[PDB]
Design a binder for this molecule. Sequence first.
Ligand SMILES: O=C(O)CCC(=O)C(=O)O
Ligand SMILES: [Fe+3]
Lengths: 428, 18
Amino acid sequence: PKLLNKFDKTIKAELDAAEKLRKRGKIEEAVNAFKELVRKYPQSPRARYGKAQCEDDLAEKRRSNEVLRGAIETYQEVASLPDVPADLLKLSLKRRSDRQQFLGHMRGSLLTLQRLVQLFPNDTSLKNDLGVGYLLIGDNDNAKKVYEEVLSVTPNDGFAKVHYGFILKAQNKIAESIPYLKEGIESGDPGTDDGRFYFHLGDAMQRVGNKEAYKWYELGHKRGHFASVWQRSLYNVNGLKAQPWWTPKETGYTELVKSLERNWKLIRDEGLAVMDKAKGLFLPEDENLREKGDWSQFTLWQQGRRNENACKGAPKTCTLLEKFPETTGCRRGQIKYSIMHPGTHVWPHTGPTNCRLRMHLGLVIPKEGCKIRCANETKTWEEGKVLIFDDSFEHEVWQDASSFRLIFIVDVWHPELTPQQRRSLPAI
Amino acid sequence: GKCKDGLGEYTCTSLEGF
Ligand SMILES: O=C(O)CCC(=O)C(=O)O
Ligand SMILES: [Fe+3]
């Protein structure tokens, strides 16, 4: 990596002295040393890069977003200096975009990545990075065009294949996504050994009836992406008791279960009132989990946050549930009514995290036709009775009754999570 | 988009620095 232009070669002794302070962990002295070099040599690209790297390390030491914001600006200043070597220009702007994403400045990172691609039009890795920038902001349409451009010049780029396959799957192009996800994973290219691609390749195969799906789940488990073949969540705390079905006593949330079962009719009645008089509060399931049928959910809490307008629609239920912070404070779960109508098949799927357990309270259960499988075990609901399962295990639902089926879904923190963990885990 | 019931988003958590 050639990082020194002609001028920087003449001051290499001063640059090496400053960088040695950084390598020895004397970040404050290194910051000041590079600051002096920037003052004395304001056009040195290596002095400016050294200043940004020191600010970067200082932000890590101090855990400071603001210090990192200063480094992000200094990385940009490197790019505007005269005679900047190409390797240094790429390194500086790449780190700038990386740190912008870390801070959540997704629009800023996208502008930096666009600049990089314009400066280095033949660097396909930079285009791949640009596609990731679009994916992080939710712009799957532009991400898809980026990876199409990469695959047109390098058809066997494994990184581009898995991301193109990921986008196809997210768009419900199930059959189309399989060879991209499969060949991309099989390429072994850097960035393809990722649980997200194992997850969706196996799921795409399950949807088309490809029995090879569980061979890929087993491989993802062997490579450390899944806790097991059945439990395939990707946002996990390791060591939590892993079990498809739970009894109330096993969870320890027996007071919550008793309150739900004793008061189930008021929960039902408010749910039916919303069905009859405010049915627009039930929103269709929107995560492509249905093969067919009608399935809607009316959410009272999400990410540990109460929906005030939703609780105006079920005020007694929200008043009841507020007494239980083990569910209202579950920032990795929800509290929601779930209605499902005959002719519905929910694809086998898993939730995103092993940090929650999922309770189902039966409210209106037809006498026949409704059942739920979790792992290798299938059960049914009962009106006024709670079922508890770990939805980080693969689960699947059928509704073949002759009338609607209404349940109440209550997520709780996994009981083995300490209060310190329940407070620090990012919301999902 | 949020990962409420599934794992369909590219990332399910938000990025907010340290
Ligand atoms: O039966 C239902 O309404 C939803 C089943 C499901 O996939 C879940 O509760 O996670
Ligand atoms: Fe589910």
